[PDB]
Symmetry: D2
DNA sequence: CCCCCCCCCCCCCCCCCCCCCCCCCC
DNA sequence: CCCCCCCCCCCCCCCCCCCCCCCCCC
């Protein structure tokens, strides 16, 4: 219970956001946030980056057009949304992946600057 | 590149916590939290099922305190994992940091 | 402009939960979660103290199940509030959605 | 326990980010996120926006310069960080406010587009 | 610390993003 | 379902951001 399960992710888009449409004209954007744990000593005596988390994201409407206009592969982003499960297909009788249904996203300003325009 | 992705989940254990032991003898408890959105409105909207892992002393306490159907509050960090299983799939799991039975519909006698 | 700001807090009740009743007779429980960062490293880094509010049946269960020093997992949404108090200050508080005693150092007998 | 208490906030800066410095040259930016619950029926029979949450934020280093270069009063932002208490002063024997120590922030792309440049 | 669910209202108690300054501002 | 804390490993169970499509990609 307690409504949906929300989540915030920070990471980089593994690719350019795929923008697609509905016969009525509603935009939906799809992309994946690769989240790599930095300074997460895991293997040998030394230290570096840890294994990565890849979450596929969905976003709709105006924001979808903005996501596609504003972001590309490699962009560092801050994302909030809610985790949704989906039963997917072809090679997998009744597949199932988790996905984030985005509420808000933006390019992080840790290593980059940004011009904000409507 | 960015810390550990945290998550809080509230829901019900789909079963009793499976308790096991790692090679060095670390107590590990596994279980799955079924999270159902209460939600013209629907009722039984699409539930979310997350597999959880928890270690050491807490694993023992979870195994001693919780059962199938227990409503729980869980915080931890999402981790992705791959696994062969007869020559390989990839599932997201929660590495639990804290978990407790929820007090919304129940009372609890804590043994500190 | 943006939904309700949620928060999860883990820590210890600074005292026993104060139970009270609203004019219509709604059960409301208040208490404060002291959250201490474990942390060349320090030890008793600056603790965070958050006042919590919880309502109805859960308030009763909290008051029946929890005491000063109980370690708890809490989720809710941050709310700001102003108050006269002898002609006015403004404090942030958590409106609890779920709370439970943590199973990290303790076991719990849930009464579903 | 469990390390720090993290938080994600979405909202608008009540003002332009105040940028300041340290004798050594480290940038720190301060600003406040006004978070207004939208579609949160509270008073009369009708519905609209609910009462607002104002959290003062702190951010350091490079990001602080980027925040100050990129954002202004009214900007909608996504913020993640950790809640910190502080004992503040003048008119208040030993004051105390909560504050967010920002880890990442960015302009939300719900109602705006953005050019990302390093 | 259990009196029927509309809104009492104070931030004080134990080895699962860490080096650095202002009054809560629709 | 309690065998000493390094890493077993499957997403299946009840009135506190809601109108809309792909294989987990450092």
């Amino acid at each position: 219970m307690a409504g949906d399960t929300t989540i915030t992710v920070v990471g980089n888009l593994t690719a350019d956001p795929e923008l697609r449409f509905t016969p009525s004209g509603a935009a939906v954007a799809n992309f994946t946030v690769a989240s790599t744990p930095r300074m997460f000593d895991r293997q040998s005596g030394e230290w570096k980056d840890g294994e990565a988390l890849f979450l596929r994201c969905n976003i709709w409407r105006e924001a979808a057009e903005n996501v596609a206009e504003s972001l590309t592969r490699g962009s560092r982003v801050i994302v909030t949304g809610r985790l949704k499960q989906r039963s997917f297909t072809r090679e997998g009788e009744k597949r199932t992946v988790v996905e984030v249904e985005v509420d808000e996203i933006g390019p992080s300003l840790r290593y980059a600057t940004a011009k904000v325009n409507k």
